[PDB]
Design a protein around this motif. Structure first.
Motif, mmCIF file in Angstrom:
data_model
loop_
_atom_site.group_PDB
_atom_site.id
_atom_site.type_symbol
_atom_site.label_atom_id
_atom_site.label_comp_id
_atom_site.label_asym_id
_atom_site.label_seq_id
_atom_site.Cartn_x
_atom_site.Cartn_y
_atom_site.Cartn_z
ATOM 1 N N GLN A 49 0.824 -1.203 0.000
ATOM 2 C CA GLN A 49 0.000 0.000 0.000
ATOM 3 C C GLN A 49 0.859 1.254 0.000
ATOM 4 O O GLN A 49 0.535 2.239 -0.677
ATOM 5 N N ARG A 53 0.929 3.759 -3.168
ATOM 6 C CA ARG A 53 0.786 5.204 -3.106
ATOM 7 C C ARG A 53 2.053 5.924 -3.535
ATOM 8 O O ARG A 53 1.975 7.079 -3.962
ATOM 9 N N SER A 57 2.023 8.201 -6.632
ATOM 10 C CA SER A 57 2.522 9.527 -6.289
ATOM 11 C C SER A 57 3.675 9.938 -7.192
ATOM 12 O O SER A 57 3.647 11.015 -7.798
#
Length: 88
Positions: A49, A53, A57
DNA sequence: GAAAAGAAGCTTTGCTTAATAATCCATATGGTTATAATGGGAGCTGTCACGGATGCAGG
């Protein structure tokens, strides 16, 4: 780069929500379990996770434009109907 | 071959938010009013040309 891994992410998402199976995208951990069992791979490993991200990102705006433009190509019959009634 | 450095993989944690107690408030429903209170109102007003169905009447 990682941009290709994101391409398979959104492509698997395109097939996934295209075939009337929706609920597995909005929840996240089960979705990442689905992606790990189908065998996508960034840098020789599974998907975390934090790693998810990061890879969402660490990303360039023009590449994001390229990804949503590629994503809209499968959903053309919806958008033609969507804009045919909005040509004001 | 050492050593900083950054990710993999665990945890917390401050914040959120959905489920649920509490409360209050719209809403319905009914009742109940004990002097007496007794037939409406816009109706348009300046078509019109035809036409068929009543309608009435005398032979």
């Amino acid at each position: 780069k990682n941009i290709d891994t994101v391409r398979e992410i959104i492509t698997v998402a395109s097939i996934l929500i295209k075939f009337s199976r929706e609920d597995i995208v909005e929840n996240r951990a089960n979705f990442i379990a689905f992606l790990n069992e189908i065998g996508v791979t960034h840098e020789g490993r599974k998907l975390n996770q934090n790693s998810f991200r990061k890879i969402v990102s660490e990303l360039t705006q023009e590449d994001k434009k390229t990804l949503i433009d590629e994503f809209n190509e499968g959903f053309e019959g919806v958008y033609r109907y969507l804009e045919m009634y909005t040509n004001k």
